[model samples]
Target chain A: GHMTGVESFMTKQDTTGKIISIDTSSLRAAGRTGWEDLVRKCIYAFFQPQGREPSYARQLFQEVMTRGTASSPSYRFILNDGTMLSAHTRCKLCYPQSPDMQPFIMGIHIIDREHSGLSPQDDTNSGMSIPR
Target chain B: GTWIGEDIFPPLLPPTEQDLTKLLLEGQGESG
Candidate 1:
């Protein structure tokens, strides 16, 4: 069932070299919310030693996570034909150390628990091994 | 951090409920 949903997002017309985002909405529906705290933990864990601004880390997540026009959701769900996948903001936030958008990048990775390998299906080449 | 070092954007625009008529009926970018 998870695989079935992910396939819905991978349109053949999508550009190569771009990340194929699997939706994390199912995780949210299952009662997992509080991504902001996860971002906080990630910031404190990584940059606290280096004396970076933690507030910046929090602000970055809040600012970037909101859905935008022509943007991929900070969280995804069944990537269908109508979904807009963009490297612009949402995808950019997926990282925790992007120099271009450093804090937001970190915040997204921290709070996005789905990236932790529990919510969304495994991200290996297995999707290609078996077609829907 | 440097894994992708690039951006990802969907080819299609965000959908509206009205678009579904076209997709289910025409199987196109139209959505719901």
Candidate 2:
């Protein structure tokens, strides 16, 4: 899933050098800014511990993204650091299983927008639900 | 140590291209 989007993006940017579709100004204007830096930090933090396992930390991070935190603005905001967070509320590290950062954020955004109960979908405005 | 999630390592739920397709299809269906 994640790779599919990247593959499609790469195809579109074949001669444009390194694929940087989401890095475009128009995309940034739409509020996709800061996600790269945040994702990078989360990814790096995943591997910084003594017994740090990227796979495990990635999954864990995703969990909080879904259920959220007590201080979270919305259930999806649990992972926020008082700054711009990923568009998708879920831990992008979980599904689509892409090891890359950008894809994770993109996939998450896709999922978020597609959700049904976000306000209109969730009765309590839970924002994001993991679907059990 | 900044904690994340429930601090549990997942067994992997690797979503597939088919899954994304299904999600897209479901999205369209629901919207309809």
Candidate 3:
């Protein structure tokens, strides 16, 4: 049950904010970079412990910080452009067999507003051509 | 349009603290 909607973006980044990969195909020209930056800010905001946090955002953050394995969770928030972006994020922490891992990895999927309310059942990699 | 998932919503109607807790617990049990 996916509807056609505005283009979306997806990305993978480390805890330190190093972007490993990104998918910006859905974004239009000119303002794409700005959209990406805002998305990054949104992701960064998810990690901080705010007075209030979205249920899945808090759960995902706790898993990455504590267990290092996160079950994917869907979240929605309004972007600076007033575009309400909905996303399902899955995170995993990686280390080089070292006692301490400096940074963590997060794989995120930005669900297009049109295809927003997909059940887990409808979610296949085929839903969108996620780059990386 | 609104996201269909029972829990997904725009910032205006952010989940209540109790709702967040319940969703977190459910997330631990299964992905939604």
Candidate 4:
């Protein structure tokens, strides 16, 4: 359960944008299949290249991996079917929770994954559409 | 044996489980 007017996803991914786990099937439109299939690909590569520098998905993982968290106020990610939807991302470092921290063991970490896709917006509504 | 980028942190000893918690947990902590 979350706020209204926003589409969100809680995903477990790695530095390479590997899909360790994802909350929604909406992300499977591209190459096809479940964790056994979709799980094997990289989200970074799945994102349609935008007009922006670096990459929202790529930077998100890089930031979360290095700095522990990263978020996008608004990012336009388009999947293969040519559906360019307005979206935003909130990524956290949930992995590698220190071992000695009881109740939970270690050698592995877990950070929360939360991605929110906002209502669809037209390119005319705002000039913020990915600009090259 | 040439240098074009940063060096990797090659460890001589396998980190004891005591500290590896940081590596795996904080390191791979992305999940189990």
For each candidate, give its TM-score against the true structure.
0.18, 0.22, 0.38, 0.37
Q: For model 2, how does the per-residue alpha-carbon lDDT over A28-75 read when each residue is reduced to its tens digit?
A: 333433434443333233323326443433443455445431111111
What stretches of model 2 exceed 4 Å from their correct place? A1-52, A62-132, B1-9, B27-32
- Model 3 CA deviation exceeding 4 Å by range: A1-33, A48-58, A97-103, A107-109, A115-132, B1-32
- Among incorrect, acceptable, medium and high, the docking class of model 1 is incorrect
- The better-scoring model by lDDT among 2 and 3 is 3
In model 1, which regions exceed 4 Å deviation? A1-30, A50-132, B1-32
Scored against the true structure, residue A1 in model 3 reaches a CA lDDT of: 16
Q: Give model 2's share of reference contacts.
A: 0.03
lDDT of model 2 at residue A17? 15
Of models 1 and 4, which has the larger DockQ?
1
Sort every candidate by lDDT, greatest first.
Answer: 3, 4, 2, 1
Q: Write the per-residue lDDT of candidate 4 for residues A23-130, one digit (tens) a residue.
A: 533333322223222221223332324466544454554455456576644434344533444445566655344653211101111111244323454243445769
lDDT of model 3 at position A115: 36
Clashing residue pairs found in predicted model 3: none
- Model 3's CAPRI class? incorrect
- Model with the higher TM-score, candidate 1 or 4: 4
When sorted by TM-score, best at the front, the candidate numbers are 3, 4, 2, 1
Candidate 3, after superposition: displacement of residue B4 in Å?
Answer: 35
Best by TM-score: 3
lDDT tens digits by residue: candidate 1, B1-32? 33222222212123233432232234335576
DockQ of each: 0.07, 0.04, 0.02, 0.04
lDDT to native, each model: 0.28, 0.29, 0.47, 0.35
